[PDB]
């Protein structure tokens, strides 16, 4: 070890990211740190709404008898998928909305049951994040051409065991959608927060941004997107107001000279990066410790 630099200050952060102890004079890009405590905003179209529950039950029986072992495998394993039946056919959902809940009815202590992702393009618990399907069917018996989800049982700090599987057939489409739950009156149609960086899922497009009110009367459609595909705005199919969406930490530019940050061009009207003076230029705000008492 020859020398070290802590990535704690603004100049040291830029040095750490540029991965060099000396930084030439110039204008460098930078992004502020994102807030981590993030509210959730949901907007959705009110639709024909019937709802089913894809409930998976797991419980396994430990042989109570002569050998009083605890760090072994259980004797028997019933897995169930609610209204499923092997002799009538694989179970799947026709209603627009549905949820998946995993019930771990294992009674033993220092024990648990779990589910892995397997080779499937989605997890069992992540379907509740407004995922689209055209038809998805579950079955404890194998479905040809489908995906397999291994089931697990875990002793704390001990070798885990596989006790079954779960086969899902999926053909992604826009007919049915998964939701976390039918809520007790709390609306999933318009519930948003404003002027605060939030993680949103607005008309089935998800991301992180800031929602504001607008001034436009755009007549057509309900979602407005950029060429990159990102969500720029949306409309509430009620009054009809337009809203706008913007990332909460847009890039800035830092002016560095003589291995020190002398200024910063900002998108907005504030005194960022510890500078005591900010002025407005025709197309950006600029903050620095200067006094404008200079000629060169």
């Amino acid at each position, epitope marked *: 070890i020859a020398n070290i630099i802590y990535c704690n200050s603004v100049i040291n952060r830029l040095r750490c990211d540029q991965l060099s102890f000396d930084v030439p004079d110039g204008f460098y890009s930078t992004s502020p740190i994102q807030p981590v*405590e993030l509210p959730v905003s949901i907007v959705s179209l009110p639709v024909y709404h019937k709802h089913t529950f894809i409930v998976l039950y797991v419980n396994f029986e430990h042989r109570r008898g002569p050998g009083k072992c605890y760090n072994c495998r259980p004797a028997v394993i019933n897995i169930t998928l609610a209204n499923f039946n092997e002799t009538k056919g694989p179970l799947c959902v026709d209603t627009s909305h549905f949820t998946t809940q995993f019930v771990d009815n294992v*009674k033993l*202590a*220092r024990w*648990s049951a779990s589910i892995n992702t397997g080779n499937c393009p989605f997890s069992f618990g992540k379907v509740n994040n407004f995922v689209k399907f055209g038809s998805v069917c579950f079955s404890l018996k194998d479905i040809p051409g489908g995906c397999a989800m291994p089931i697990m049982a875990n002793l704390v700090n001990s070798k885990s065991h596989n006790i079954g599987s779960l086969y899902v057939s999926w053909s992604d489409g826009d007919v049915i959608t998964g939701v976390p739950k039918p809520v007790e009156g709390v609306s999933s149609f318009m519930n948003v927060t404003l002027n605060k960086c939030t993680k949103y899922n607005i008309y089935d497009v998800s991301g992180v941004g800031v929602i504001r009110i607008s001034n436009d009367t755009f007549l057509n459609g309900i979602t407005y997107t950029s060429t990159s595909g990102n969500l720029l705005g949306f409309k509430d199919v009620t009054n009809g107001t337009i809203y706008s969406i913007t990332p909460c930490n847009p890039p800035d530019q830092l002016v560095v000279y003589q291995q020190a940050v002398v200024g910063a061009m900002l998108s907005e009207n504030f005194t960022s990066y510890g500078f005591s003076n900010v002025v407005e230029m025709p197309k950006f705000f600029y903050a620095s410790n200067g006094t404008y008492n200079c000629t060169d």
Partner: antibody
Amino acid sequence: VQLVESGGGLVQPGGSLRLSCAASGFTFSSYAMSWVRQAPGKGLEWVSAIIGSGSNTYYADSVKGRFTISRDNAKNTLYLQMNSLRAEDTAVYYCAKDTTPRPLYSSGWYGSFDYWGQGTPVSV
Amino acid sequence: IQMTQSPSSLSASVGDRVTITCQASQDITTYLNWYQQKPGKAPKLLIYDASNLETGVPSRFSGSGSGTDFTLTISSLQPEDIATYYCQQYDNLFLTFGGGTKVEIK
């Protein structure tokens, strides 16, 4: 590992209390929890319960209609929101920690507790 | 659902084979646990599944059963025991402990 409680005292019948509990040294959000009490010179009886996800809460028969339970998974806090005390709530409380770690989405069984804090006494 | 612990308190010396029977008022068949209460302390865990020694405690405790007769016993009491013991079942969402027992100085 460290466990601690807060918020015990003396209030009138029918009042309110913010019983609190804090933890450190383990994954708070994945373990089940249950508040258990002990009247002075009496046995121990279960009061309330909560799974790692926090989807559902479980209450005792005599406790029903009086106290409610919640946590905050963001910064390792756990509570009993207390209301409507009668006369016999005088006891010491514990935020006993359930042994089993469970997946963050599952609703699973519970009921065996490893570590207990310092205990917090309350009276009415 | 309840459990009766009897006798309520017994005094014992260094070396005796103390025993407590936790009548769970009905058959639970393995879901139980025990705790150690040295006076003035928060309860600590002793036994779980009515069989498994908590590794924070020395191995000089044991218990077994099948039905309602589930027990807890001491091989040979060591002088610092002088504590209260409580049992509980973990079969049901509505779990109820017992009345307790004691071992006392002698």
